[PDB]
Amino acid sequence: APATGGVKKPHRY
Amino acid sequence: QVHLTHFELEGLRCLVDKLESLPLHKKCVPTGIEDEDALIADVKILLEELASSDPKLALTGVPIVQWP
Amino acid sequence: RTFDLEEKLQTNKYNANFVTFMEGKDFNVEYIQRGGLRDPLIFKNSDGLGIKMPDPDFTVNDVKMCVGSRRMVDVMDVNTQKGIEMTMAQWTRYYETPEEEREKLYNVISLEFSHTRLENMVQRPSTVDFIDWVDNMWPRHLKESQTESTNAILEMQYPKVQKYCLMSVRGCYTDFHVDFGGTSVWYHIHQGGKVFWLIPPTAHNLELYENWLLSGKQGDIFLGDRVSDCQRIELKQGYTFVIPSGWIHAVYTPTDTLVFGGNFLHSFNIPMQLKIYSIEDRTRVPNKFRYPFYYEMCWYVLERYVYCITNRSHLTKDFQKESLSMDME
Ligand SMILES: O=C(O)CCC(=O)C(=O)O
Ligand code: NI
């Protein structure tokens, strides 16, 4: 599982 | 001699205080930067010299930082 | 989710007027120097912006073909606001599924397509090119070295956040958030439409937001009800929207839609950008949902300003040579 960056997402509930 | 906006002057002061105040393990000085401390110093000096920017002369329609 | 989204779309209580409606030609660097990009902007038409978009009838399958069937994509489970992963081919099959047959509501908002065929089919507003820290501050030879089109961090040579495609089915919701690193944002509604709730980044609102995040109670509390002034506004096909640093927003998708947009930092609201970074620090946001190389970029900004103004460099000798060679081109 390569680590990514620059992922657009709000906090989960 | 050159005129920055206040937005910029205030900004770069926040920036310099921020970066200076970080511990070494959080500083994230990138590979291309030679001497961070010397860079900090030059920003401080520069900010002194530009405090006196004219607000309406800084509205040039072209940014200060552009590639040649 | 414990609040009624259908009531949030119907009420008139979100009646602030924060958004300025502008003509493309007026959106220039001087406008940025004057106002500091503090106001959200809507351009009802693209004239004068310098944008370029694909064929109006471009589909999600065309996106797939440009970026690769096997490319892993971050997907949002709308009900939970959690993230999952699937290949673009699977995403496409979902998106082509008729509305009634979709089991779950899923949203894609984080497909960064730079260094794919699609990159050249979409051009940002010219003005953003003049001020974006990526284009104007990051050492150009590193940016140009990027080969990888996914957001794998070990392959990433620069903050890969400039060009995103967003694909959203009818009924998608993205809850209140501030974009990473306090980035500003542009969004072009290529097909469909969006509804936004906008909350200005006053100290008090940013305190509420941070508290709301640490509460863990964001499914239950609609954040536009906890503030004084909020604006609900609809974007229609062909509109372009610019969101300033720190603005807190949520988004609803009334119809199947395709959006092209991106993030940028700039030099005229750094204090706000720094505020949002450190809100992320305090609320413990995993590094993957952040702006890559934030402080690294900040260092390069300082160096650029000193250099352009005083002509004293604080880049290594190698980096200066790399740069000179780019100026020779
Ligand atoms: O369009 C959406 O549903 C979410 C848009 C947004 O705010 C984002 O991508 O950060
Ligand atoms: Ni957003």
- SS3 letters across C162-192: CCEEEEECCCEEEEEECCHHHCEEEEEEEEE
Domains, chain C = 1-293 (2.60.120.650)
Alpha-carbon gap, residue C9 to C106, rounded angstroms: 20
Neighbours of C327 (CB within 10 A): 9
Q: Which residues pair with A4 in a beta bridge?
A: C152
Q: What is the DSSP string of C257-286?
A: EEEEEEEE--TTSHHHHHHHHHHHHHHT--
Note whether C104 and C77 are within 8 A (CB). Answer: yes
Residue written as tokens 């690294």?
A: C296
Q: What's the token pair of residue C286?
A: 């995993």
Alpha-carbon gap, residue A11 to A2, rounded angstroms: 21
Q: How far is the CA of C287 from the centre of ligand 1 (A)?
A: 19
Beta strand C20-21 pairing with C41-43: parallel
Residue type, C70: R
Neighbours of C74 (CB within 10 A): 20
Domains, chain B = 1-68 (6.10.280.250)
Which C-chain residues 136-195 have CB contacts (< 8 A) with chain B?
Answer: 136-137, 139-140
The residue whose CA is least distant from atom 2 of ligand 1 is C251
Alpha-carbon gap, residue C177 to C248, rounded angstroms: 5
Residue written as tokens 């989204």?
A: C5
Q: What is the resolution of this structure in A?
A: 2.3
Note whether A9 and C74 are within 8 A (CB). Answer: yes
The angle formed by the CA atoms of residues C27, C267 and C49, to the nearest 5 degrees, is 20
Neighbours of C88 (CB within 10 A): 23
The conformation of residue C228, written as its DSSP 8-state character, comes to: S
Alpha-carbon gap, residue B13 to C99, rounded angstroms: 52
Neighbours of C219 (CB within 10 A): 15
* C166 alpha carbon, distance to own chain's centre: 10
Alpha-carbon gap, residue C20 to C241, rounded angstroms: 10
> Does the beta carbon of B48 lie under 8 angstroms from any beta carbon of chain C?
no
Alpha-carbon gap, residue C196 to C67, rounded angstroms: 28
Is the CA virtual torsion C164, C169, C170, C172 positive or negative?
Answer: negative
Length of chain A: 13
Neighbours of C119 (CB within 10 A): 16
Q: Which residues pair with C248 in a beta bridge?
A: C199
φ/ψ of B18, rounded to 5, equals: -65, -55
Q: Which residues does C21 contact at the CB level (< 8 Å), separation at least 6?
A: C41, C42, C43, C44
Residue type, A9: K
Q: Tell me how far CA of residue C245 lies from CA of C13, C132, C208, C312, in angstroms.
A: 24, 13, 17, 30
Per DSSP, helices labelled H in chain A are none
Alpha-carbon gap, residue C158 to C125, rounded angstroms: 20
Alpha-carbon gap, residue C156 to C145, rounded angstroms: 9
Angle at which helices C294-310 and B6-20 pack, to 10 degrees? 130
Pocket test for ligand 1, best of C75, C76, C107, C109 (most atoms within 8 A of CB): C109
The conformation of residue C19, written as its DSSP 8-state character, comes to: P
Which chains does C contact via 3+ CB–CB distances below 8 A?
A: A, B
Q: How far is the CA of C159 from the centre of ligand 2 (A)?
A: 17
